[PDB]
């Protein structure tokens, strides 16, 4: 019904207004502290070194930022190697798109447009195939019995695909307990902020991350699909009663 | 069948090996030219300004990088907040749509905790809204088709003129981006990839930011409904 579309739209709209209010309250006080610090650090540099013009500083800051955006760290004296470029391709296909590395060339951006257009539906067919095999394994008072088993599969999945890999990330990458879970959640939800990326020590570390992404993504999507299928059947019985 | 799962897996794996080979061939020669340029630009700066020690340069280069990671641009004297009433609302929508640009991200301890829970409950909320918009779009598509693969090309081409071509014109004139950069932003956005290399309302209208999220909402629910209508026929076929 169209009435439920406007209702769901309003709920989504107020959820963004609510979330936005909380995000501002947590991040904006810190954002102001970071804005004051860089402004002070630049004003001190120009005062200590009378040889460097404020525009000459801006020109070098821009060169450092340009090199950072491209992937080369200005600090110190490859992201496109056989394995890292393969992982980048997988990052595009999985709709994660971290953004730490991105196609800077003219031809790379054209190829990436076409690569995503044809590559994302190719991955969807693979996710469908893995979800069908996972659904058969998952299958192996009446409405609450089916929902009780759904809680069991969701909790167990959060110990194997969420808790277990976060332990590995905390010991390998040296990240905090929260940063290790935050990476797992943002990765599995295909959000891909890029603030934390696996492999920033071992050659088997990069292929084990994409395999975790492949199995972990196809497990939680299949649970949401098998639950959404039962919810569609329950919505038919709920529409006939009310 | 499980035979088709292993076959699709092998096709996906060779597609990443193929794509990875092309990406390296296009990006790695430029990556080497960017590495040599920053090294040269730093060696020239230290030679022209004998007052700045190479470590004093590295200290400031680190401060500039640190501010960029936090979200504040070191370039400029205005160091335009990313967490204002509208920009924070747009960030929330960026999380829900699984786009996650990454230009701005929750740096605080509490912000990361709230973001974990916000995505957990928020992504399935948007999925129900996408399902609702896809059902209304499917009824319009069914009536437009009546007036099977030939009609699918007609709906896909028309959608690329309104949701892809038309907004890219607006981005090229408002943001001042190139013709390719305007399409690349649209494609990366609507595919929920969200690289974050290009974002709406970058750095300098009140209606601009809410019109971007509405374009994301209608543009996402149109192409997903077209792919699901095809996927309905693929399940039967």
């Amino acid at each position: 019904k169209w009435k439920t579309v406007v209702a769901i739209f309003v709920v989504v709209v107020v959820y963004l207004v609510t979330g936005g209010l909380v995000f501002r309250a947590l991040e904006q006080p810190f954002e102001s502290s970071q804005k004051n610090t860089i402004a002070l650090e630049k004003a001190e540099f120009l005062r200590d070194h009378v040889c460097v013009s404020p525009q000459e500083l801006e020109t070098l800051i821009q060169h450092a930022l340009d090199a950072d955006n491209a992937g080369v760290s200005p600090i110190g004296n490859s992201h496109w190697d056989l394995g890292s470029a393969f992982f980048f391709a997988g990052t595009v296909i999985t709709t994660i798109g971290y953004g730490n590395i991105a196609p800077s060339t003219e031809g790379g951006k054209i190829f990436c447009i076409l690569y995503a257009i044809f590559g994302i539906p190719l991955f969807g067919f693979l996710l469908a195939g893995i979800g069908d095999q996972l659904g058969t394994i998952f299958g192996k008072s009446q409405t609450k019995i089916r929902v009780i088993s759904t809680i069991l599969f969701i909790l167990a999945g959060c110990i194997v695909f969420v808790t277990i890999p976060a332990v590995i990330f905390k010991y390998i990458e040296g990240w905090t307990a929260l940063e290790s879970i935050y990476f797992v959640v943002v990765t599995l939800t295909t959000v891909g902020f890029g603030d934390f990326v696996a492999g920033g020590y071992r050659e088997w570390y990069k292929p084990l991350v994409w395999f975790w992404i492949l199995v972990g993504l196809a497990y939680f999507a299949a649970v949401l699909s098998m639950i959404g299928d039962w919810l569609r059947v329950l919505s038919k019985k709920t529409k006939e009663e009310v | 069948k499980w035979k088709t799962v292993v076959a699709i897996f092998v096709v996906v794996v060779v597609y990443l090996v193929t794509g990875g080979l092309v990406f390296r061939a296009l990006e790695q020669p430029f990556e080497s030219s960017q590495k040599n340029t920053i090294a040269l630009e730093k060696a020239e700066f230290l030679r022209d300004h004998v007052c700045v020690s190479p470590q004093e340069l590295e200290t400031l280069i680190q401060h500039a990088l640190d501010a960029d990671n936090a979200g504040v641009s070191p370039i400029g004297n205005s160091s335009s907040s990313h967490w204002d009433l509208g920009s924070a609302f747009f960030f929330a929508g960026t999380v829900i749509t699984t786009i996650g640009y990454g230009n701005i991200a929750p740096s605080t301890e509490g912000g990361k905790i709230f973001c974990i829970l916000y995505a957990i409950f928020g992504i399935p909320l948007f999925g129900f809204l996408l399902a609702g918009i896809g059902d209304q779009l499917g009824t319009i598509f069914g009536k437009s088709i009546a007036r099977r693969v030939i009609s699918t090309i007609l709906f896909i081409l028309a959608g690329c003129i309104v949701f892809v071509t038309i907004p890219a014109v607006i981005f090229k004139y408002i943001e001042g981006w190139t013709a390719l950069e305007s399409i690349y932003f649209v494609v990366v956005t609507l595919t929920t990839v969200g690289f974050g290399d290009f974002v709406a309302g970058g750095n300098a209208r009140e209606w601009y930011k809410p019109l971007v999220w509405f374009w994301i909402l209608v543009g996402l629910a149109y192409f997903a409904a077209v792919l699901s209508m095809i996927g309905d026929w693929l399940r039967v076929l």
Epitope: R47, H49, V50, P54 | -
Partner: nanobody, 123 residues
Framework: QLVESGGGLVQAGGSLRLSCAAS????????MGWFRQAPGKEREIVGA????????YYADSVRGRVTISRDYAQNTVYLQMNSLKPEDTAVYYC???????????????????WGQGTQVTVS
């Protein structure tokens, strides 16, 4: 507070020795400099020097002739412009912006503390 001493008439090819003492109790540290306002032109930068005096700057108009000195014990900057040209006839002001805005432009339109200015004429 920036008090100056050294202006006056000087023959062509001679030397100009200017001074500028900072009587202000600003214990934060400030970069000092010298500027000149030409009769028909705008204000131009002559040179600059850091608070400690470890690094100096000279404009392209006078880089091979001038020398910005500094007595840190008495908080005073000095200017010794040798082999003077007629083009050097201007009012010489000393500046001191401890917020990084001394070098902002060639005129010093963002300078915090300005001197009294001394008239210099080259025959």
């Amino acid at each position: 507070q920036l008090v100056e001493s050294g202006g006056g008439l000087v023959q062509a090819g001679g030397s100009l020795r200017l001074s500028c003492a900072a009587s202000g109790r600003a214990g934060s540290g400030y970069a000092m400099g010298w500027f000149r306002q030409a009769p028909g032109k705008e204000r131009e930068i002559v040179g600059a020097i850091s608070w400690s005096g470890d690094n100096t700057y000279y404009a392209d108009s006078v880089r091979g002739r001038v020398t910005i000195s500094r007595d840190y014990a008495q908080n005073t900057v000095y200017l010794q412009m040798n082999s003077l040209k007629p083009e050097d006839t201007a009012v010489y002001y000393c500046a001191a912006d401890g917020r990084g805005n001394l070098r902002r432009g060639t005129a010093g339109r963002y300078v915090e503390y300005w001197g009294q200015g001394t008239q210099v004429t080259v025959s």
